[PDB]
Amino acid sequence: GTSKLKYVLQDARFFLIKSNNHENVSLAKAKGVWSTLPVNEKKLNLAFRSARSVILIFSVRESGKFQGFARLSSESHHGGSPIHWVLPAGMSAKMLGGVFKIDWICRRELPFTKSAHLTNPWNEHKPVKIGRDGQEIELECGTQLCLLFPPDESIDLYQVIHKM
Ligand SMILES: CNc1nc(Cl)nc2[nH]cnc12
């Protein structure tokens, strides 16, 4: 069903995450962590304090798809055991140094062809697939986008609801 999912998404904020490779999204699904560049790290930390739920919606660049979405369970933190991100050219471990804990809500894929009817007011009403890493997605667009994903029957939202 979709009722607990809708409850988690109620009054949530949504951010598009654009990963340069599949490896880091796979690592994030395994370990429940994400790291981003400092400009987006600051934005996500602000949002985490401001809203009942902050949702990251993941897309691997050039994949033509979203790979799932997750809810922040912490602000970023440093000093943990270094996460073995595969680094793109020009990107270093130091500027992925802040680590967010996340709880996956859906680890299933959604092709961009299925979200072509959704436009993001915060990016000039371009299709929601379009946007830089960190682009915020307006509430209604983000809610509808998350509801398009196939159900992930491996996930139980009971614990996530109690973190709000
Ligand atoms: C683990 N974080 C990231 N990994 C990759 Cl491959 N690309 C990115 N662009 C913004 N953040 C990232």
Swiss-Prot record:
Protein location: Nucleus; Nucleus speckle
Result when mutating W85A: Abolishes binding to N6-methyladenosine (m6A)-containing RNAs. Abolishes binding to m6A-containing mRNAs
Effect after changing R132F: Reduced binding affinity for N6-methyladenosine (m6A)-containing RNAs by 9-fold
Segment forming the signal sequence: none
Phosphoserine carried by residues: S81, S92
Reported effect, F66D: Abolishes RNA-binding and ability to influence alternative splice site selection
Residues reported in the UniProt entry to bind RNA: K18, S19, N20, W34, S35, W85, D133
Effect the entry attributes to changing M95A: Reduced binding to N6-methyladenosine (m6A)-containing RNAs
Mod. after translation: Tyrosine phosphorylated.
Annotated YTH domain residues: 12-149
Domain of life: Eukaryota
Mutation effect (W104D): Does not affect ability to influence alternative splice site selection
Role noted for this protein: Regulator of alternative splicing that specifically recognizes and binds N6-methyladenosine (m6A)-containing RNAs. M6A is a modification present at internal sites of mRNAs and some non-coding RNAs and plays a role in the efficiency of mRNA splicing, processing and stability. Acts as a key regulator of exon-inclusion or exon-skipping during alternative splicing via interaction with mRNA splicing factors SRSF3 and SRSF10.
Subunit organization: Interacts with SRSF1. Interacts with SRSF2. Interacts with SRSF3. Interacts with SRSF7. Interacts with SRSF10. Interacts with CPSF6. Interacts with KHDRBS1/SAM68. Interacts with TRA2B. Interacts with KHDRBS3. Interacts with EMD. Interacts with RBMX. Interacts with ZCCHC8.
Comment text on domains: The YTH domain mediates RNA-binding.
Listed name of the protein: YTH domain-containing protein 1
Lineage: Eukaryota, Metazoa, Chordata, Craniata, Vertebrata
Residues of the full protein shown: 345 to 507 of 727
